[PDB]
Amino acid sequence: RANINDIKANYDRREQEWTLQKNQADKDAEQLAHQYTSVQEQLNMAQK
């Protein structure tokens, strides 16, 4: 029964780690959207 509890606890810990990695990838996408906007406005500045 202790081994069952440890297996399920490791499953919960890797669910928490997956949640952290998913949130960090969402924050990286929210960064790269604004950086795409910056490079596109640099393109408008060079095209002027």
Partner: protein, 48 residues
């Protein structure tokens, strides 16, 4: 004839100052346009 030569020199002086004023006025107009397109460049530079 000396009077004719004197007014020929005066006509040459006036007639070259007229063309120099035309060139100066054209340069002022087109620099006035360039210094507005540079303001547009500096408008995009803050959006970046």
């Amino acid at each position: 004839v000396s009077s004719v030569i004197q007014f020929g020199n005066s006509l040459q002086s006036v007639l070259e100052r007229q063309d120099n004023e035309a060139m100066t006025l054209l340069f002022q107009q087109q620099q006035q346009k360039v210094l507005q397109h540079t303001k547009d460049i500096q408008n995009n530079n803050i959006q970046v």
